[PDB]
Design a protein around this ligand. Sequence first.
Ligand code: YUD
Lengths: 99, 99
Amino acid sequence: PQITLWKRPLVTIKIGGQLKEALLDTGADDTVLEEMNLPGRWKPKMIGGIGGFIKVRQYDQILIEICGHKAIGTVLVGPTPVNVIGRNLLTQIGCTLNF
Amino acid sequence: PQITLWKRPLVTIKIGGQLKEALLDTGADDTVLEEMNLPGRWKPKMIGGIGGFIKVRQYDQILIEICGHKAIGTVLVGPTPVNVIGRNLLTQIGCTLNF
Ligand SMILES: CC[C@H](C)CN(C[C@@H](O)[C@H](Cc1ccccc1)NC(=O)O[C@H]1CO[C@H]2OCC[C@H]21)S(=O)(=O)c1ccc2c(c1)CC[C@@H]2O
């Protein structure tokens, strides 16, 4: 599909057996999702942006479906105000910017 | 152009007659640039990101050229970790997401 940017580019994703809403975010290196109790091992990380840093849990090789497109990679879980699909997964679903 | 996302989507911008590097950020509603001198009036504003809120100087109706495409719109100036081009200007240059 083609998504215009008049409004936030929100899509439905499937992760951990749950459906959520997330932004297709070309400014996020990696994917960051709202607090969720995923199974498996993780490693602590600190990620910074406007306003400062938040603490997150880094889970590797997590399966995510984004608008029916399957992907697998790193997901950072923590107290983010929004779910963002980052470049690490956007490349996997074939997403580009065009103008 | 069609821009893939294996690397950060960094581009050259022109604002106030100076060239700069900036990130095309579909997850940003607004455009936020690092501290710089900009002519004209401005009003104090607050913006929130992943890590909380910061104080910015809001410049309205500013000419800015992004990878050869002209825009005129609001530019927030303040202690952002990186220059971000957000949707208020991405729409002006006709940028969409495609996969
Ligand atoms: C530094 C470049 C940008 C800022 C990096 N961000 C991604 C941007 O799209 C954020 C997304 C977002 C965060 C909160 C609420 C809504 C949207 N938008 C943003 O701040 O927008 C501002 C300006 O416009 C306004 O509208 C929205 C908020 C205001 S990040 O979320 O901070 C991030 C993600 C992954 C990762 C990191 C850092 C570090 C490694 C890891 O990979």
